Write a protein that binds this ligand. Structure first.
Ligand SMILES: O=C(O)c1ccccn1
Ligand SMILES: O=C(O)c1ccccn1
Ligand SMILES: O=C(O)c1ccccn1
Ligand SMILES: O=C(O)c1ccccn1
Ligand SMILES: O=C(O)c1ccccn1
Ligand SMILES: [Zn+2]
Ligand SMILES: [Zn+2]
Ligand SMILES: [Zn+2]
Ligand SMILES: [Zn+2]
Ligand SMILES: [Zn+2]
Lengths: 298, 288, 298, 298, 299
């Protein structure tokens, strides 16, 4: 059963049990859903509606332009080198480009700014729960992530349109995320996101007004492997356009990333590096195995 | 024999024959095809190619939406405005290349429309630019393009691609499929095919030119029929008077009292929208 | 000015003028287009339509698989030994293989059979006009071409898909045709076929519902050089997929080919041979000079 | 310091810094000189000699004829409506008139033809360097310039003879060039060409065996203002006849010119138009401000 | 993208700060603005307009038709880029008035023109003082700079743009920037035609009854070190409508020294320092050529 965490149970004497659920999702799933997370359901509903309307208005034509430009009109053999995906990226931190994206509406930009700020505070709240579960001092992960200019925080807004031949192409090929903590607002009707657990692909179930959390490669390093970043993918379907609004809380470019000493006894197998060196490498090898990227930092 | 006019034959000895053919088509056919019209054949090929491919990606799967159907058109369409103001950069489903080509195509058809109106002026004995002046109104002529496809129909005898009507506006410049037929005009009690022809433009005159010419050039009924296989493309540009243009029979063409009304074009168009497939003649009477 | 012959003008006031024009193209161009040839325009439209749709359904992915098979994905330098071409061949005579091309529909197969029979009759009518212009007896060329089983007649169905860098690769390299008379139904929008005349490449202009005629090597031999087989090529372009349905009316395999004695005063420089010996040689050296193939038949 | 670019440094490990100099000149100067290009110094020396000898034999007459019919033999006061300039034009593309200029020698025409071909290839190589610096796809600008008949390429051969009172008249009044890329072989001793930069006229220094490059109005549109076409003029002097062999690589007549979409964020202030409409208008208003010509294309 | 209209009466009250900020925004971003409630009597504007239009009809219109005849502009076969479709005369007020020397004007027109020009000269100096305040300069700075030895130069260009059968062939007045200081225009309130270039588009300066159009010339661009630029403008013709134009030019005296104000120059200026009459002698010959070479020529 996929972990669903009720964050409102942290405000009372059920808080220890909630923390234990968070910790075991972090150790064994790499993913969990959160409900009662404090984000207004009214804000999620308009983010959802304006994301979908901005797709028809602005992204659908770019998407078909892409399928023509790569011959994906007609899928007669398996395509393992492209994602059946429509995306644009919004940067929040350290410097916002929200007011420079030309094709987004005023009210969409205002909703995205509010949504991004609330998710940034929720990311930092979640990192503190991780710290507590890890036996780290409060604020430890936030301070590691800061670097010189503060954390990097952006939002990937994706749609995975219907695919006539889902067997032939993935919406997004299997990978682990490079960063710190990932907070996903996904479609509540159209499924597609899957994680790999114990040798099976497991669906990340659509759930109304929920946020999906998962941990990236940097948290595997800092926890000395105690919390691993898990492989995940998006599969297409013939009917349905799955919406994806995923926010990435990453260390600053010059943050020093290393295994926390209190989590290391035997010499660590994980490297110590500067985050931007990891991200330069990751961009070119995102869909290749994760383990060579750690070795490359030594 | 359907009139085909070679516009390259206007510069010379050949001009009086050509002008006589244009006038004969305007009086008796209401339609004619033009060749050697100055539009680059590469631009037409790109327009045709991108129109057919945009139907593929953006219109065909929505068009998924036993007896004779007399109230629906078997048609997939979207509209582009050029004048007085263009919404070309606001149509969501069009690519940048298609948009750049339509803008170039639209400007050239606008210049050719005004050249054709000047040929009509000469044949009518009107001063050059007379029809363009009449069409201007306050904000200039209205000019837009209707991009249509008529997909194959299993039972073409049950439904028309587009029911019989006359066009409300001024002059219509049609870039139609050069293989798949379908457009027909009504002449002397017979439906006549408007023959597909490579790199040609089909011209026809609308209701506003019938008024201005005091019936000398009438707007002719036409339709699009479906067929069981073939998707006929249609890129049709409508050069119309401005909304507040005053439309009336040109005085030099009226010796009598005219049976045709004098009105403002937008009053004709508001009425036209609701009664497009009913008879033409009541729309003229309604303007008195 | 590229020769366009109106076959309706044989009926026959300008019939001498039409014949003189045919003769002048045969001597000086090696190519000419014919209009009003008797082939139903609706059959041509069906052939063109089904050929283009059969490419998209069956050849376009095979073509992209061949490109990556041969490394033409990257055209960083000139390719002089490959044609940027998708083709299959249909044999009509003496023995048809129309029923063995498996990915074609019964409608396409029935239309190609009707088209091929009409083109075979037009080929023989054209050969009789050449006979008259050359002063040969009626039916002379048909009789020479017959051999024991009759003429060889087949159709090459080609498409030349768009090429990102057309200056690196040809759709089909320069060559002369080995056979008798070639009847080409080519794309009426997309150009590409060129012939060499007076030291210049001249486009063979797309013309709707026209047939392009050219003379092959066997007619150069029979006419003792009076009608030469002309070099031609297909160039690619970056946008546009030129279709080509080209039918080859050739002598039978065991036909004896020699210069017609009434066209020879001075001893001929051309050989006398059996057609299949010429064809066995031609297959290996098609894109090398033509003149050594004549010498090799002595 | 006026930018001088060594093109031979593109073949090696200094190529990035060379590209950076090119991009800097394109953004901030609109002009740059190139050395170590492909042109043989002996070909430049012969072009220069035969241009100067062709002035004395053929153009000096037409120049004094010009001064006669305009009353410019004695300059009492300023002349702001004529250029103190002797010119003839050589067209190379899409069609050459080189063999139709009556008063040009056989060897001048052969040198002029070889020179033009090398400058045409250098124009296209330089346009690809701009593409790379702009982040556009390879060949982007050449493809935009092509239209139906290919680029327009011609050569303006000018001499600016000595002027008794240089204060009264310019060799060529201030203007921006209408076209794409301009490649100038100018006099290496007699100066005169100046550009306007930061509120000062700056000499374009004569330099042995160099080519001066500048960008025209069409590249400002395509780059959405990132590379502007800058005002330039030729001043006269009392002693010295400055030679000018200027080759203009322009889009084809029916080329569609518009800002490249990857260079546009907010709505562009630059129009989208067909090049020949720009040129019709430019011819009559060449020495009036540039900015109204862009406004006229909307 | 609304054309700026400034209510000058709002300077007398609690909204003076907001009004000054609007004026400053128009100076930086438009180079043009319209003013209302400017203090010129509406009845004087009406008489100027009436007498200007009647003086065209009786005295200028015959000359204009005769001007076309002499230049063969009866027949607009092709585009004319070197002639203005314009009927004009000029009135010099300062330093020396020639008003009593124009022969074909009535005494009533001459008296109204003298009164109109005096009020416009006072309004020009009031506006220059608003610019000074917005620029952080001392009160009277621009008037002092403009004075030279004999005071500012002030004249009025009285123009009509008669109907043109083929407007696409010829402009009423070709695109240019004005050479001088501040330009105060009383234009037709019905017939449009004046346009300015802003952000790559021609923008109509909309006719507005009893308004004055203000624009800044090349000299204020120099003095403000480019903070207020002189903007390109033109007059287009139409097939019917005769646009009237009464434009007054408040310019520095001939021997005035023009340079960027020292408090606006934190690093070396791209703008020259010169004497105004040298700029004007050059400008007369190159008025319809680009502006930027004229600044370079003064160095
Ligand atoms: O696009 C991704 O890589 C993604 C999105 C949401 C959650 C995890 N990963
Ligand atoms: O859609 C129409 O009404 C139409 C289209 C093309 C030509 C004439 N009429
Ligand atoms: O493929 C060929 O060699 C060919 C095709 C058509 C016409 C001439 N030659
Ligand atoms: O004659 C010209 O306009 C020119 C010549 C060379 C370089 C730039 N411009
Ligand atoms: O005549 C001019 O140059 C003018 C007239 C009015 C306003 C601005 N400029
Ligand atoms: Zn991911
Ligand atoms: Zn219609
Ligand atoms: Zn061949
Ligand atoms: Zn120039
Ligand atoms: Zn002015």
């Amino acid at each position: 059963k996929f972990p669903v965490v009720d964050l409102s149970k942290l405000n009372g004497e059920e808080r220890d049990q909630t923390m234990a659920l968070i910790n075991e999702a972090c150790e064994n799933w790499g993913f969990f859903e959160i409900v009662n997370h404090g984000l207004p359901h009214d804000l999620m509903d308009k983010i959802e509606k304006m994301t979908k309307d901005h797709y028809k208005t602005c992204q659908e034509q770019k998407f078909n332009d892409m399928l023509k430009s790569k011959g994906l009109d007609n899928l007669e053999t398996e395509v393992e080198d492209v994602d059946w995906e429509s995306t644009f990226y919004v940067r929040h931190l350290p410097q916002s480009n929200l007011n420079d994206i030309s094709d987004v509406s005023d009210e969409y930009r205002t909703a995205m700014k509010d949504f991004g700020k609330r998710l940034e505070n929720l990311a930092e709240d979640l990192l503190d729960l991780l710290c507590e579960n890890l036996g780290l001092e409060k604020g430890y992960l936030k301070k590691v992530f800061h670097g010189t200019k503060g954390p990097t925080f952006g939002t990937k807004v994706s749609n995975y349109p219907p695919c006539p031949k889902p067997e032939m192409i993935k919406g997004l090929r299997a990978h682990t995320d490079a960063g710190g903590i990932i907070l996903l607002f996904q479609d509540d009707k159209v499924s597609g996101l899957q994680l790999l657990k114990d040798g099976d692909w497991i669906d990340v179930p659509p759930l109304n007004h929920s946020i999906v959390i998962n941990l990236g490669d940097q948290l595997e390093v800092i926890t000395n492997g105690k919390y691993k970043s898990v492989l995940h993918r998006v599969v297409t379907q013939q009917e349905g356009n799955r919406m994806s609004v995923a926010s990435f809380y990453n260390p600053g470019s010059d943050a020093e990333i290393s295994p926390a000493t209190s989590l290391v006894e035997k010499d660590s197998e994980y490297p110590s590096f500067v985050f931007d060196d990891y991200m330069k490498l990751y961009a070119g090898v995102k869909f290749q195995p994760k383990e060579p990227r750690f070795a490359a930092m030594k």
